[PDB]
Design a protein around this ligand. Sequence first.
Ligand SMILES: *NS(=O)(=O)OC[C@H]1O[C@@H](n2cnc3c(Nc4cccc(C#C)c4)ncnc32)[C@H](O)[C@@H]1O
Ligand SMILES: [Cl-]
Ligand SMILES: [Cl-]
Ligand SMILES: [Cl-]
Ligand SMILES: [Cl-]
Lengths: 1006, 76
Amino acid sequence: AAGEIDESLYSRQLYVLGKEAMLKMQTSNVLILGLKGLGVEIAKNVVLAGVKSMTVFDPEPVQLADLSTQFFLTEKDIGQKRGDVTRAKLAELNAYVPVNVLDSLDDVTQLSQFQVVVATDTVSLEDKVKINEFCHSSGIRFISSETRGLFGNTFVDLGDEFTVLDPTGEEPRTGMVSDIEPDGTVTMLDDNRHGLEDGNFVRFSEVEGLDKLNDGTLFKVEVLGPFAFRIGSVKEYGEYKKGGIFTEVKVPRKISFKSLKQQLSNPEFVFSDFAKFDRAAQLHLGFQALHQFAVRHNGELPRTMNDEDANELIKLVTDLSVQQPEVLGEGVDVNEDLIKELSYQARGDIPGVVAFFGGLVAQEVLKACSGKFTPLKQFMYFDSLESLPDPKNFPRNEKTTQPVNSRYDNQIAVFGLDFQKKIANSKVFLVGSGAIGCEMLKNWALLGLGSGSDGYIVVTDNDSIEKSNLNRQFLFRPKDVGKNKSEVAAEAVCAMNPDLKGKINAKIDKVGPETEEIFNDSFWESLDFVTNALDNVDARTYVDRRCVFYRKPLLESGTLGTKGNTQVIIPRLTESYSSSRDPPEKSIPLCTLRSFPNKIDHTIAWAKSLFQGYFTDSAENVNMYLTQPNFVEQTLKQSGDVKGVLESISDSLSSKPHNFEDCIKWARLEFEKKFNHDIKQLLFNFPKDAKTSNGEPFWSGAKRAPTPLEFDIYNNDHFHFVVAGASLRAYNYGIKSDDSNSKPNVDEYKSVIDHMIIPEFTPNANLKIQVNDDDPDDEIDQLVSSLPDPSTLAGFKLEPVDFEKDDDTNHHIEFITACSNCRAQNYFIETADRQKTKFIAGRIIPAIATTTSLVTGLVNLELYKLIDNKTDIEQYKNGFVNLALPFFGFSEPIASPKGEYNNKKYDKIWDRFDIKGDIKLSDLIEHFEKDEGLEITMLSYGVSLLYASFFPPKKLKERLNLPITQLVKLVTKKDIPAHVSTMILEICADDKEGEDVEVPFITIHL
Amino acid sequence: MQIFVKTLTGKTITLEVESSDTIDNVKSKIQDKEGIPPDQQRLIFAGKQLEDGRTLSDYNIQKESTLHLVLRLRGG
Ligand SMILES: *NS(=O)(=O)OC[C@H]1O[C@@H](n2cnc3c(Nc4cccc(C#C)c4)ncnc32)[C@H](O)[C@@H]1O
Ligand SMILES: [Cl-]
Ligand SMILES: [Cl-]
Ligand SMILES: [Cl-]
Ligand SMILES: [Cl-]
């Protein structure tokens, strides 16, 4: 039972990696050496991802300080072996992956049992070089990684031959062609961009006149501009006539890695941050120097914040640069402060850095197993030194950073005791307890965030745990399915760190406009900062606006597959989230959906809306009609599509099925209408051979001439359209399925369909069909008098379907896939399978744990900068990543725009006029003139104009004496609700010269 | 001079620019190539985000420099 993937657990990951890659991952055995923080983080991500087996080696005994980042250790484990104690926790992450302990590595020859060996911070450099030599010379892929305080690195060596099967994981480019010239110049249809790059390869289909160009041969692309590319002479193939689709093909690439010993002396770097590229050679020397330091001190690292040892580390680096001048370069000095910091921090074990490397290295493990994505080639170094607090507020020296006999001792090694107490005493709100959220809470448990007596965490999420979540929401187990995310997460991180017991408040409330009573002034004002862990833009915008209104910092992040980002929003300093726009989703023109599809996305959207109509909308409508004595009257005066609502009601109540056999009949007749009749009508209006006024053929380019379908129960899609249609119709009308216990029987459906008289198509010569979205496009009394009186249907109720993409038994994706593919057959579009249909109809976001951990690590390195209240914008980093490439880049936040009125500077995002009390209008106007030099010219509450300078005296006399709430009452005819504590008012104003100037908004505190 | 723009998807775009050109200018060239409206473009280089109204020389952008065109993602 391998060669198949558990879609119900791996569905989201499957969309990032693909089935081939995952089948290879399922034959790979992985070995991790070292199970401190870094190792357990790698191992967690790799075990969630699904490899054939995971084996861990760490015979070292657990000490208290290991718990800094090793979230599966507990104080009870102290004295026992790390490997032994961690194993059973890693196993619970993924029942499909055995997790074993390797007792001993004295015999290196054991390594051969493994395809990928990863060596962490616990393995000496000398042992790394031996192990890597053994691995490299024997075909075993090798990765190492280390973290030291705010610094880290990784090294990848996949051997002398490694084949990358797909370098990016992007959808292959595809596009329609309108011409191919004899020299191979391919012109795109209309204004469609090919989107290719020089060196891509493509295949072709449907190119008439160049027959063998369609046989799957690849052609190498030369880009001419955005709308043309060139493929080499094609005169040998024939002469282009018409048609054509190109599809990008990713060719395999063979690449070669060198051994650790060779790369120690001549490294190839990938940069983790281009602003810091000069440091990658320094740290390369510095990490070698740590290891030399350890050899000279009996396996020990430099002492925390110790000067003598730091000067020894600097001497060691200086000696490496003299021995190898090409390394930093001719006459480039050692960066001594950098290397000093490396020494000072060498023992530190920082959660964010461990997360960042754990995700990155885990993902490199999966690349090594599959050939999916481009491997890191070969060394990457990182630092987050900006995370250090200002030494003026939190001095770092041997006393303040010393161990205190606590799990936090190796965070204290970096930041000092007082800073670590301030972390404990922070009050934080986490919005979302899904992938980012589980990772976030794990990091916060490791920080001790909110564990102090002045601190706390609030986390909220309204959603419950679903099976596919278990692939990347690592605090949840199979038995937690159906429970609340936030509540289960909060409990799990208290088992990881009991200092948080009673300090996390898990709520189940949605954060939005409808929950401002719970999440009220007092709630928001108490917080030090807010963090998002969200899956949609609207929630993000909402939280961002709250953080602006209440002046709190916000940490934002997101992922899509291997892609991710971080954003910090700092009061009085930066832009907020809402300040910039992201690309909207592409909309499909309506004509293309209705009449002229050419891609499966079009047929899936059309199918999805047919589903909505047949099984949800038409039922809701029937129920409203039978329960609302005014419904017909309300519909006539207020619907866009009036005739359509009343026909849906008419058709739902005349065709009433009495048994399952009627539901089969109904589905078969719908097949006829949608894939035979309706197509014939479209062909009647525009025949196959029709031409435009210019004599060009009408059916060309994006318009593909359809063929009507002849139902064929042996065709998988036809069969399934009738099975799903019938079972859903039955649901609607509360009829028992002949299939609610069982798979559907072909012969049984067939004998029902075979006995039906299917009515023939008659063209309707009246119907015009709309060609473009530009072009535009009484019988209702009859339709209304045909409706049955509701009292003939007392107690009749239809049961609407609530789309559920993740229940394979409910026929939903089955219907949408089949309905889509039948239309796909009509228009000669390639059919899609269930998984792909579900991805598109279900709007599923590709997701994986690696990226989630890494991005969360980076959020928690910014968090340190909120703890120190940094106001220097250049210290903060917005992050952007794509692990597939791999690529990491960072940018300092954009400053908030500033304005001026009279002599006063203000922040256009963060400043506002705070007015205390339900002030009278006159007092408000006078206050602005007298205190701000501003002549108020318009004053509004939402859409309602409350005052304006052009109001005549009679209108001003009604208003000037009114408190703001009574002014709002007078204009809207609605009282302000009682729970409302604030009112935002927008003003226009003139300044002291009589000139209109932009100014902040007002907030009324009631 | 030529500079390069790499996207988050791995794609490499080559541009012909002079250092006196504005970021608005560069953004409109990216639009000619990719179809991305200037206001949707986030361009980073050397630890800075490139802002409208500044020039290439304001960010120290030499010949052969690689700019990254980046995105915010919505999953989580
Ligand atoms: N990435 S994930 O899917 O693994 O985790 C995301 C996590 O966040 C929860 N979630 C999503 N939105 C919210 C909101 N507010 C909200 C939702 C929709 C629209 C608006 C508005 C305006 C606000 N509050 C709380 N939790 C949210 C998901 O449930 C998921 O677990
Ligand atoms: Cl066990
Ligand atoms: Cl060994
Ligand atoms: Cl959405
Ligand atoms: Cl991706």
